[PDB]
Design a protein around this nucleic acid. Structure first.
Lengths: 50, 48, 171, 52, 130, 163
RNA sequence: UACAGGCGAGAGACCGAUAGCGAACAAGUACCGCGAGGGAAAGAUGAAAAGGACUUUGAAAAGAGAGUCAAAGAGUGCUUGAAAUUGCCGGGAGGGAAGCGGAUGGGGGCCGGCGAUGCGCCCCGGCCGUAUGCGGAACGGCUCUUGCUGGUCCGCCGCUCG
RNA sequence: GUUCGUCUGACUUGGGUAUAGGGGCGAAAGACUAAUCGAACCAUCUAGUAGCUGGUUCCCUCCGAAGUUUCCCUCAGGAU
RNA sequence: GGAGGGCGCGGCGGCCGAUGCAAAACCCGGGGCGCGAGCCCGGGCGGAGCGGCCGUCGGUGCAGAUCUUGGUGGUAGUAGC
RNA sequence: UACUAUCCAGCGAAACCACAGCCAAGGGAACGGGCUUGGCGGAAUCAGCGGGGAAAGAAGACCCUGUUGAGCUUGACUCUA
RNA sequence: CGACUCUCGGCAACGGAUAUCUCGGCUCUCGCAUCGAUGAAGAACGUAGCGAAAUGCGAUACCUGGUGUGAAUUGCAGAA
């Protein structure tokens, strides 16, 4: 039989983003490469440059 | 105890107005007119 | 033998047999196994012939609810329930004949010993359905059964040999 | 059945909306079809603008 | 998955086509790796085989057998080669199927239409290389 | 045991460093206050700690107006501790300077306050130079006002006879 | 601008054989009903059938040997083969005794565990060598042009000892 | 099964043929109309509704009720 | 009845591990951990892929429902034929 | 007196089952197989039996209630061929 | 005192769950226009060497011409 719930086309697979909110996140991401600790923490193997 | 047609809250937002009471507006119709002809917007927007 | 059960012996020293999907009462044919286990080949064969004739009864130690009762109980002295199912006795007799022959294939003597181990299991249940009153239908079904029979050459001489200082007098 | 200082809600739903529907499922594809149509129009005209 | 507006891409579809193989599908999947001598003549690594070829088992447990390709089977995509066999209980010998990828081509019958395949693919390999 | 005894066990629990504190910068800042408060005599810095704990949905934006109006020569240009943020909906050119410190400033505020005078100071600096927490007012900020006391919903919350 | 059909395609934080469509398989099939209509159950040996010749028992079906297989603890009940139930057997218990099936205590029955075996000292055997000079370097506080104080280490030679 | 009503007529019974669902037919019992009749069966609308009965799925922690007030076609239930 | 803090399963982005010299699964009056939810490990069976951890998400955990579907008892080798 | 039952050989269901099954009285959802207190306390059982299991079959057909229906009636409400 | 009643393990039988598979379903998205008295949609009954079925086809009957590919089809037989 059917079940009254189990999905059926309604469910939003679109959540809206705020551009000002998004801007902060993008900006933060650049800064994360200039601190070596986060790069190591994420699990990058690096023998990298001076 | 529930059967969700009691505590769920009945079905429809009437009986809260119907014979029960609290909230909203009471004593309803005021003026009427204007229709979809005479319609929108008289603006007030501050100069400050 | 199949994907095999409790043999516990040596395979060369033992014989194995199975009959498969014989239609017999599951309840009757086990009781035959219990009542006549370990006894020599000729004596066991004769006992089964006796059951058919009604010279010897099989004690029905288990099973009640008004189950058929002792014309004679015979072995084990008295015992309240007893029946002498002829057909199931015949089927195990045929299996016994096969087991004797199987021993020869091993290179064991036909002369060899007695039934060490028997199991009886319900192989499946065969379908058929029979009509009943009030427009309902309720099944009448038979059970095919697999029965295994083990003859073991170890059992008699191991007990006999280190009876000394007292004890022995048997075979 | 409000238990709030809300006005009791005015829907708009107002029919079986499951029967009707309308989805923005088509919307992600939708812009692309207009855009590729514009590219095709440029090919059709060849020189001269003719945006409209 | 990976790129391109094209007809073909679907994990199910790839399986569906190659198992039941229509004739063009059979021939392209009948492409079996050449031996090294032949690779430097026709300048290709693999070509579709035949029945009057001779083909040597490299890959399997059965390795070291050689024989002519007796038959090729569509329905379950397999090829059958002579002398790669298993014995039935009575003593009958029945061929064991081998995939054309596993087996390596010892010898070619050129033909005329099969010969055309060699020329076009060779031209292909010339263009990229130089 | 008692009902009296149960009364002690059912006591308060306002207490919370907020249910979720997402902001790492907020979270480290309250640790700095936590360390200094128990190592200093300052009642004032202890008050700051509570206002930066429980909620951000309670921290009030404060306009340049009224900030200016209570430092009117009866506070000689001290430091204004603003819990939430400065907002810029005024022009008077305010006071001719003032040192304003806050948790957050609007981008407009950063330009506007410093180009009126003083300096937009961060709360990190407030902690640094005044763990003692003196010569300081927690300036103001309201949310209890005309709009949104119990004035919610659709049609507010009333004069009061019936509602 | 539309698109749950048709045809030909691309995909999914889809489903994984009681799920997914009614149908993965001969499915709108078999079957049910007078009819309108209702409508299942049902996938998997293995790389390859190499699907058990032959011998023997049995009326035959089967069994027992054997052959085959990497594996028959894979033999078209076929990959894995759970619970329930059933059989065998073993253990406990006992045929003078009353049952909520457990908890609590003791004994049996069953089984895993239990510093590599420690320290001070001296003798022999074994190996290495500091300080200081040499020779090559990653370091420090810092300064940050630039400067001064502090390095340790390894290579391994010299000179004295351990 | 026994006992028994009728058995030359308002008789018995077949085939062909007519009448179909608020309809038929009825020497009338609401009887009967394909094991179905105080409104047949089938599919659909329909995943219809039901203050009422049943069931409602992993753990631990801390706090911990009430069957009362008011209104109600309300007294098996809501609002408050 | 609320709130709080966890556990287990399936799949997804990350990250790390494990494997035919034996994975997962299943069995185990075998050991050990956690108050528990559960977890861990051994032995047996087995033969090809899987688990832990950090995020994400659900068709996410069962004893019932005169439960649904499949299997199997006692009844009973009894009523009976 | 027949045909059963019974007893045999063969064949072989179902209903039903929380777990089961020795009494007395007591209290208790106010009438216990179980609890409490006394009496007791056959293994293993068959043919019988109709006290009991408030045995089983049937969401009591009655009776009340539901803002639940439907058949019918009419001087109901409201429409109409 | 065998037995019985009970329990468990080990090995099994029962059963088809579980795991792991999946030429399938499911849902979304894209492209496409294109039935018929010129005999359709749908049915029936036949035709394969050996066929019950599905699939294919129609007395020109598991197919024909033409064309592409270029040697298989296979369970066995068979044409060469």
């Amino acid at each position: 039989g059917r079940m009254f719930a189990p999905t059926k086309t309604w469910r939003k697979w679109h959540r809206r983003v705020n551009v000002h909110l998004r801007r902060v996140a993008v900006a933060s991401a650049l800064a994360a490469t200039s601190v070596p600790s986060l790069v190591l923490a994420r699990g990058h193997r690096i023998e990298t440059v001076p | 105890m529930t059967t969700r047609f009691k505590k769920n809250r009945k079905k429809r937002g009437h009986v809260s107005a119907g014979h029960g009471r609290i909230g909203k507006h009471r004593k309803h119709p005021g003026g009427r007119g204007n229709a979809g002809g005479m319609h929108h917007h008289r603006i007030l927007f501050d100069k400050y | 033998m199949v994907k095999y059960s409790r043999e516990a012996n040596n395979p060369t020293k033992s014989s194995k047999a199975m009959g498969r999907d014989l239609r017999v009462h599951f309840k009757n044919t086990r009781e035959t196994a219990f009542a006549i286990r370990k006894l020599p080949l000729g004596k066991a064969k004769r006992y089964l012939e006796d059951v058919i004739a009604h010279k010897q009864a099989i004690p029905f130690r288990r099973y009640c609810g008004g189950v058929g009762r002792t014309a004679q109980a015979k072995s084990r002295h008295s015992n309240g329930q007893g029946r002498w199912p002829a057909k199931s006795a015949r089927f195990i007799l045929d299996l016994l004949k096969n087991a004797e022959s199987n021993a020869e294939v091993k290179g064991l003597d036909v002369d060899t010993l007695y039934v060490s181990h028997i199991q009886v299991n319900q192989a499946q249940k065969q379908r058929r359905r029979t009509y009943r009153a009030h427009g309902r239908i309720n099944p009448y079904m038979s059970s095919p059964c697999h029965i295994e029979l083990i003859l073991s050459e170890k059992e008699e001489p191991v007990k006999k040999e280190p009876e000394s200082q007292i004890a022995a007098r048997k075979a | 059945m409000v238990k709030h200082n809300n006005v009791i809600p005015n829907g708009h739903f107002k029919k079986h909306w499951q029967n009707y529907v309308k989805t923005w499922f088509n919307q992600p594809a939708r812009k692309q079809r207009r855009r590729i149509a514009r590219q095709k129009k440029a090919v059709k005209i060849f020189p001269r603008p003719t945006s409209g | 998955m990976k790129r391109n507006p094209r007809v073909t891409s679907s994990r199910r579809k790839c399986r569906k086509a190659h198992f039941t193989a229509p004739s063009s599908v059979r021939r392209v999947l009948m492409s079996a790796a050449l031996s090294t001598e032949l690779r430097h003549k026709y300048n290709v690594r693999s070509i579709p085989i035949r029945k009057d070829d001779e083909v040597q088992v490299v890959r399997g447990s059965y390795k070291g057998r050689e024989g002519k390709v007796v038959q090729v089977y569509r329905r379950r995509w397999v090829i059958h080669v002579e002398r790669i066999t298993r014995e039935k209980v009575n003593g009958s010998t029945v061929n064991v199927g081998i995939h054309p990828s596993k087996v390596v081509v010892t010898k070619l019958k050129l033909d005329k239409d099969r010969k055309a395949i060699l020329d076009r693919k060779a031209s292909g390999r010339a263009a990229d290389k130089a | 045991m008692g009902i009296d005894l149960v009364a002690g066990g059912r006591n308060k629990r306002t207490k919370r460093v907020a249910p979720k504190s997402d902001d790492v910068y907020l979270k480290l800042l309250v640790k700095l206050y936590r360390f200094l408060v128990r190592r200093t005599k300052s009642k004032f810095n202890a008050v700051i700690l509570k206002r930066l704990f429980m909620s951000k949905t309670n921290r009030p934006p404060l306009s340049m107006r009224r900030l200016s109006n209570f430092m009117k020569g009866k506070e000689e240009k001290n430091i204004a501790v603003v819990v939430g943020t400065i907002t810029d909906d005024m022009r008077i050119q305010e006071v001719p300077a003032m040192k304003v410190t806050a948790l957050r400033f609007t981008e407009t505020a950063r330009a506007r306050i410093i180009n009126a005078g003083g300096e937009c100071l961060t709360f990190d600096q407030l902690a640094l130079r005044a763990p003692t927490g003196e010569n300081t007012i927690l300036l103001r900020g309201p949310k209890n006002a005309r709009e949104a006391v119990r004035h919610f919903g659709k049609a507010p919350g009333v004069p009061h006879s019936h509602t």
